[PDB]
Amino acid sequence: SLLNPSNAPTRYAERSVGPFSLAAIWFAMAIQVAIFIAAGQMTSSFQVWQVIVAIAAGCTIAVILLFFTQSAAIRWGINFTVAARMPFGIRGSLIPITLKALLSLFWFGFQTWLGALALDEITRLLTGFTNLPLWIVIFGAIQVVTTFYGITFIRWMNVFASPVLLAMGVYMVYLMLDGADVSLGEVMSMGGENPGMPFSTAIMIFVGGWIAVVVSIHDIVKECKVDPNASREGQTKADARYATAQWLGMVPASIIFGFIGAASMVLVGEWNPVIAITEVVGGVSIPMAILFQVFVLLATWSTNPAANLLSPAYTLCSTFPRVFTFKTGVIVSAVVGLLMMPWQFAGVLNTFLNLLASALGPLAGIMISDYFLVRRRRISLHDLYRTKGIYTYWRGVNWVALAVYAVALAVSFLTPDLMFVTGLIAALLLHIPAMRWVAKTFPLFSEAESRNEDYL
């Protein structure tokens, strides 16, 4: 048995996130430093309004993906790590999942760093003392302790951060535009003086940004509110109501702040708003500086935990269920996380983001296909928590699914500027014949699937 209280399906009465609340999580989750860099650097290849469009477009494809990748977790309260067990093996899933937990972990050390930079700036603008690594750990530590309260803290922190972040940001735009003596419409076309990058690969850079979160949303959305006695058509509006809520959370948030990153770049030559606003205004008081840094901290806190730390936690406590618990998995993930020292990664994000999509594109495709197409949403919780059952395949690993991943990865390379969308679609489509083959050796359903509601 692989079950323990932390890695267990989430009972109907334990669910706490409705559609408005999930939006309140996503709005604050989209407000984060890294989108300044991406959308800023985008101004090299396109002008600001197009970048906003590449953001809105990229935000929207992510949501279309969320609608499908979230549907099993909402209905059945299960993990990401647990859910991968279906098409890949019970252990074979560890292969893509280790790929993915690493990614998740990479973002965690990056943002803890940005957070640390902020806190270190606040202090040295007071105490002149400027030690960063201590502030790194301390922040890593602070996130861990606030992550202990799982989605409960997250949900309360993001609803209050959201408007504050929203206001600090609208203010930010005012300060720039004003202090530069420029209208909104004027800045909107000042960019794009070095074309070459396809607009498709632009959209693909923002899609490739959230793909880790989108693919493994489970760990967030297994907490959303569901009515067990709906129907096919009431379940679909429910999925859609949640999917709609994520759109209204991440789009307007990442459009306003994407715009700020782009604006910074285009007005002053730097993606970092500290610099762009400081110059344009010609210095700022120590208070109003500290503010900005409180923002970065508030903006890092609203994104890092929920998006980067939750999912390796659940990966640990659910693979080694007697060794790790959620809280203990959080401690081990944040330590490993910081010991990856991701702040030394050579390059820029865009190409990395272009990497992230085409690396997990087939993974999202194989999971959507297994659950929706092959099995028709008809799953067995019982077998997901047991070493030997209908998800054990060949001695714990489903090599055919690992085969479909490779093949689909290959085909993905045949369309470099659309890598992600071909690899997903390829994996999606190939899983079907591959699974209709495996079904001749192994069963796709189980009698024990009637105990599903016992868990809930």
Q: Enumerate binding residues for Na ion (CB under 5 A).
A: 28, 31-32, 299, 302-303
- Rounded to whole angstroms, how far apart are CA atoms 371 and 368? 6
Q: Burial-class residue 367 by CB neighbours within 10 Å (0-12, 13-18, 19+).
A: buried
Q: Shortest distance, CB of residue 354 to ligand B5H, whole angstroms?
A: 11
- 3-state SS assignment for residue 394: strand
Q: Which residue is nearest to ligand B5H (CB)?
A: 209
Q: Shortest distance, CB of residue 349 to Na ion, whole angstroms?
A: 16
Dihedral class, residue 191 (left if φ above 0, else alpha if ψ from -120 to 50, else beta): beta
Residue 82 vs residues 92, 116, 257, 312: alpha-carbon distances, Å? 12, 33, 34, 12
Question: Could you say which of 119, 213, 316, 364 contacts ligand B5H (CB under 6 A)?
Answer: 213
- 35 binding ligand B5H? (CB under 6 A): yes
Question: Could you say which of 52, 212, 298, 360 contacts ligand B5H (CB under 6 A)?
Answer: 212
Q: Which residue is nearest to Na ion (CB)?
A: 302
User: Within 13 A of 435's CA, how many CA atoms are on the CB side?
Assistant: 26
Q: Shortest distance, CB of residue 380 to Na ion, whole angstroms?
A: 37
434, 401 Cβ separation under 8 angstroms: yes
Handedness of CA 320, 326, 327, 330 (dihedral sign): positive
Closer to Na ion by CB, 172 or 266: give it.
172
Q: Which two tokens stand for residue 329?
A: 């998995």
- 41 binding ligand B5H? (CB under 6 A): no
Closer to ligand B5H by CB, 148 or 352: give it.
352
Closer to ligand B5H by CB, 35 or 277: give it.
35
- 114 binding ligand B5H? (CB under 6 A): no
Residues 285-304 that bind ligand B5H (CB under 6 A): 303
Question: Could you say which of 22, 307, 313, 366 contacts ligand B5H (CB under 6 A)?
Answer: 307
316, 94 Cβ separation under 8 angstroms: no
| Relative orientation angle of helices 94-124 and 286-301, to the nearest 10 degrees | 170
- Rounded to whole angstroms, how far apart are CA atoms 376 and 433? 15
Residue in the block written with tokens 């948030």: 253
Question: Could you say which of 17, 38, 260, 316 contacts ligand B5H (CB under 6 A)?
Answer: 38
Name the binder of 210 from Na ion, ligand B5H, none, CB < 5-8 A by kind: ligand B5H
Question: Could you say which of 111, 112, 162, 358 contacts ligand B5H (CB under 6 A)?
Answer: 111
Judged by the rule CB under 6 A, the positions of this chain that interact with ligand B5H are 34-35, 38, 107, 111, 206, 209-210, 212-213, 303, 307-308, 349
